[PDB]
Design a protein around this ligand. Sequence first.
Ligand code: TPP
Ligand code: TPP
Ligand code: MG
Ligand code: MG
Lengths: 788, 788
Amino acid sequence: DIATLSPNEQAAIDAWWRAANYLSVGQIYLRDNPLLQEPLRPEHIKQRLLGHWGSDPGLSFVYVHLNRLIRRLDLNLIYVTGPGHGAPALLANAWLEGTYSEVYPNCQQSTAGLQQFFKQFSFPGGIGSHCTPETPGSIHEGGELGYSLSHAFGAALDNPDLIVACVIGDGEAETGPLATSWHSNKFLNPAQDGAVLPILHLNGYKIANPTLLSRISHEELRSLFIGYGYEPFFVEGNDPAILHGVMASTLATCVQKIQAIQAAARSGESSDRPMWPMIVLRTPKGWTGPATIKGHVVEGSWRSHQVPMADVLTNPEHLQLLEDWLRSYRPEELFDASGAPVAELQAIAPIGDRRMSANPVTNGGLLRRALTLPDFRDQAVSVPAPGKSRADSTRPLGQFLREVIRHNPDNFRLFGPDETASNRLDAVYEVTSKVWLGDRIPEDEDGGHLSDRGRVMEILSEHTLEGWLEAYLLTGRHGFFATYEAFAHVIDSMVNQHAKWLDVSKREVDWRAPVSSLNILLSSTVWRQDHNGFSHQDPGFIDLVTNKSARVTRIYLPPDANCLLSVADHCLRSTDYINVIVADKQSHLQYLDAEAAARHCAKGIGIWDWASNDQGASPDVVIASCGDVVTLEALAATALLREHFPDLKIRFVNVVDLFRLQPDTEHPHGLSDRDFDSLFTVDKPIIFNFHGYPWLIHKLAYRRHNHNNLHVRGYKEVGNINTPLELAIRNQVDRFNLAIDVIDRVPHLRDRGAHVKEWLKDQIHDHIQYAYQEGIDRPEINQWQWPF
Amino acid sequence: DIATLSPNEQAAIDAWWRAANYLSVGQIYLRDNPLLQEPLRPEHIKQRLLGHWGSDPGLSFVYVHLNRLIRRLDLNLIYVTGPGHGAPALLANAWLEGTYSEVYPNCQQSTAGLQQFFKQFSFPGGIGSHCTPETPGSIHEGGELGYSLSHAFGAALDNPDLIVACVIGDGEAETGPLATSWHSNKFLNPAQDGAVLPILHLNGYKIANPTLLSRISHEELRSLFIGYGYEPFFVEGNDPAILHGVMASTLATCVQKIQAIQAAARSGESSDRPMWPMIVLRTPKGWTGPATIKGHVVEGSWRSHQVPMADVLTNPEHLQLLEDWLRSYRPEELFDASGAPVAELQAIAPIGDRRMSANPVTNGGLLRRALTLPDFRDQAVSVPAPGKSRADSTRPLGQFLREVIRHNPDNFRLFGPDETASNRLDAVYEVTSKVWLGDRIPEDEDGGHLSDRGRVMEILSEHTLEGWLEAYLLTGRHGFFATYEAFAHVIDSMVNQHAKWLDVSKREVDWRAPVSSLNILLSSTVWRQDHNGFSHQDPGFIDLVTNKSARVTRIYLPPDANCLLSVADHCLRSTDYINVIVADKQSHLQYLDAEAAARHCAKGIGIWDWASNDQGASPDVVIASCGDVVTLEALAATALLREHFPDLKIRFVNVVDLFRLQPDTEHPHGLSDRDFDSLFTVDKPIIFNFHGYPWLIHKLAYRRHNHNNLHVRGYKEVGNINTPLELAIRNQVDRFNLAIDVIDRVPHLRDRGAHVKEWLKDQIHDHIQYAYQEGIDRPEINQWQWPF
Ligand SMILES: Cc1ncc(C[n+]2csc(CCOP(=O)(O)OP(=O)(O)O)c2C)c(N)n1
Ligand SMILES: Cc1ncc(C[n+]2csc(CCOP(=O)(O)OP(=O)(O)O)c2C)c(N)n1
Ligand SMILES: [Mg+2]
Ligand SMILES: [Mg+2]
């Protein structure tokens, strides 16, 4: 009898649904007089109205039904919100359940607390309109549309008993990130993971246009959602008496299929991809609000979004209509004299930790356990001489990630857009394979590593790929993202959303516990110009990350394999940061030992003693490199200068942590003025060789005393197709161009070095001519190693 | 008998198909000996192999069939390429048709030209691997995957007889932008536009993973593409004798339905959305290449993508296998002694302008006609006194765009993410409405402006929306894009792709004719904090545009309505630039007359004489503003300083064109050093008030002499919910914060202005306290106007 509902409990469900809508309008409009004891007056209304109403009836409608289902079956839900502007619906339900009062004691369940609850919403010094981190039981901000469904799957990536209900707006569903995210049901594993129940709020209207998915036929819509792999269920109408029975029946129908699918998967009798249940709602937008106000339809139309009436203070007629709107819910029976909800509402509310707004999964920092990782020195390569031994840097990282997977079989996952095999990370394929959960052929078995059980996710859409990871970290787990640098502009919008969440959670919100860090690995940098990716790769993703504050994002550019392992080991321990690691796939030199890499990453920036020419004397020039390809050119430039100018004294500085360049005033993590002056001399010129746009270094080191003597060579532009050496010539980061620049800046080499500067220009022209004749660099260029 | 094919012509089609694959492998591998007259030797092979082979057989297979269909029905095709790495297939067909020889006389149809044709591909000083602007008959760069289908629809937005064939890779269909772009059939109007025939290359494998759409069932795949609204047709197998007959039959089936749909729409008897034809190909990836090389399957698998064999020079066995691969096409019969294609291939090639690689639509600059622009002074607002009259700035722009629509009914369109009504641009709705081509209700008629015929497209997904515009401009037409600034990070990847195309077309390619400019309008800036959008809006889109060269992007920030019209009028005339216009939706002051706005936009940056305090004397401080909200604060700061310091001399400078700040050496458009020193004094401090990140101004004006005296206030961070005045206080761009800053920088006000600086801090505290109690700014703040 779960599908059917008793008539008596339907009134209590409707009473909860009315109370949620009453509180929703109250915080949108009312500033004082919460219970309408006295007649409404303009001083009780907020001056500026930024709340959103269009999604509020739908979210409150689903939420109360879920509380009914969570009482009987003793489930656990999260309720990630799609539209994101339906926060009044969530906060009203959180207040009714008592969760909001416990989190915020000021908003007590009383008449005075109700006045404070309405006052704080959409107000200066108060909670925001969207689903902010201050909102209890929320992981998805929802301000940017299209990432809600991916966050639903990410929260259930390793929780078997968890159930996630994601409400999808029809205006949101046409977005590119949400169009692909439906296919994520295939990669979800029913045996070891929870079930996500998507709900489509097909209200029919956007802010100003009819929705695309409501203006298609019912047959075409059913065809479309069958192709996505979901079992479609349709709930239509606008009569609450009909809608309560139908929607409760459909919810009971879907959850039993969800339990049937999970039980069949864990039993192993049905090892195949099932069509997951899904619910479609055709309820009109704002169907519990005013119908017609100014001669136009305000219910079930685009006019129902965020504004029932434009002006209330100016026009007393609208205020009278507003007062009648609040009276339509009959608030007198819903609340007592004290202002608390009546005993009918208290009984039907979930009790204890089972409350969806109080689920520990949403506040994943409490659920988070520290990652158990082995020592990286076991997987580090051995270097007898720095700069003379050549080995690929991807293999040590792949082995290290494999060891973490075995030691952390549940709370760790790896994400890659078909570049895990490309980036030579096949070491993790030894123990675990990628998860596909589809039809397989024996040709696939020999070729690709695919299985139903796996810890590596695979999809080309980086939108849904990063959406899985962001929710995975906010749930309390740990993850790692590896991709090309060329396609990092795709996730540009999503990173800013996640950086916004961490910034508010760390500072403004006090009850939010810290979650794991966001580790993004960028491979195949713009300098090598690999076969994949467009010809004009852009390293501009590093710049937009630096636009975010240094207290939420960290950028690391390790030169070699050992320094890559130390960065990867250190970043897996951090909590409230976004870690961007830029390493190159191609085989390179190795400069640091396993022990020396740890010391280097501890400081972040340090002098390389073997590369440095003279110690105990003031250097004539400071040569600095940041990336790994440009580090080789910086080292090769040092070899040429030391060969042709024996008396020249060169200090070599390598920077791994970019934000160390920022002064100590900007952030405590940055180097102090005395520390910076020790590394880079106060007066001698600095020849910085930066991977990426050369101006980014000037932004960080602007406040430094020696900024005027800082010279940066970096990425400027790329030709259609170029050799690795001649691409550096175009951007003037080649070994010869750096050596030319050092001659110019050093005061006593501008006259002595004229012959050498002429010789270097001959080498530039000679190598370019050989590149045009043969198409490949000279053998002594590719096989270069540190002379001394 | 169009569906069936004669056996004799099938051999000629196969002969063309073999020749295309032979030329495809030749340019990938061979550097010399194009016709294999002598046995193959390693010096004939390219040293580094950056070509991709996996998509090449499929593209050549479709192209030769299309040439068959274009001969009989006398159609016109474009063949936008999805994978983008199938450029060898395109260039081979272009060379065979003779188009490439005409465009590039060096690559003549001869043995010597064949040697040059193979040599130039994937080589320094040669054509790139992807389909670049150098490729004849190409509009889509194809390096980024997911934007191909949108470019197919955009090229046919106003060409009625044009037919566009877009080949879609199955791996590309995993991308978010491609998943949404299927629904673009609904926005396409069959009556006045051409038909786009999408082809799905469902080969089953990506570079390293099986494709998602091949691992779904045939029934679910058919359900998915029915929901998109397309008529699905399936072509499967790997036998050329079978595949030639089936694929030619399906093409003839689809084109007649395309002609039936277009004829029915133009007759008006069938005014409904039809199911467009679509073709699905299950051919294995690289099914004409080697099968097994190193004990693994290299045909119809992920190994077929990119290069089939890793080493050729090192291993002579692979070179022998490579030689056998070239012999499998039997090149001796395909070419004569001179190296030209035989008379069998010449006869079946399209003749004249009908060649798809030589279609004038692809080189849209030739097709482009100058826009007929009505004088904007008719729609400009009237201002008797600058800074005292308040009027909304969106309405004059909407009227101006309406007039352009009537005067240019065919080659002009508007694009918005259902924000045109939000942007108060309903003036264009008077004459033309939005295009929907779906079911409609009388409620929609009163509320929304929807009709089958329209010039404004409105879909929320900016990926497909911006993709429509890019192809529209490359076709030779004109357009205008309007959207919010908060969601400009969505089109971040797409803008860099378009700027790459224009930069190469401007300099490297000489036969490319100039096309229309890309005009993007950004509204609802971060300062107003409208109801829509997330609370933490980011103006970072301005910064990433500036990362690209100043010779391809222009950024305009007009302060008022008249300056907005002059910018919009001027940018509709420009050709090879990306124009980003940042104006604010909210009602503001007006500072410039219709005539004075034209003079202001002519210079780009100019002194405002009425705002300037003293003329004929050296100013004590230069106050500069860039945006429109920050311009009001800069003006209000000037009013306070002139009120409290009568002796103070203030010069007010407003900048509209951002790149004018760059020195003349960086670009000829930038101001000279003497011009910059006239505007901004060489020694007096400059208080710059910039909309967006404050460091962008330092990047542009870094090389200036007076850069050290430049002080920029701009966007730093935004709270959860703030009033417009309080948000400026936190970012220190408020009128009081600017007035405080002027007191600090001016040497003779640091002592005299201590009392005034104390008074200003009281005003900051007072307004914040009023904001917290009331939630709205004081009435005199909102109704401020210029006193003098
Ligand atoms: C990509 C993008 N386009 C537009 C917006 C602006 N926006 C914010 S909320 C909203 C309404 C979405 O409508 P729908 O998904 O139907 O939700 P409903 O309110 O009807 O439940 C829009 C257009 C946005 N945030 N992101
Ligand atoms: C968004 C994105 N993800 C990944 C890549 C890298 N990439 C370039 S080509 C390619 C292969 C996918 O091509 P597919 O659509 O399978 O084409 P087909 O081989 O069938 O022609 C990949 C993954 C990219 N360019 N863009
Ligand atoms: Mg809607
Ligand atoms: Mg493929």
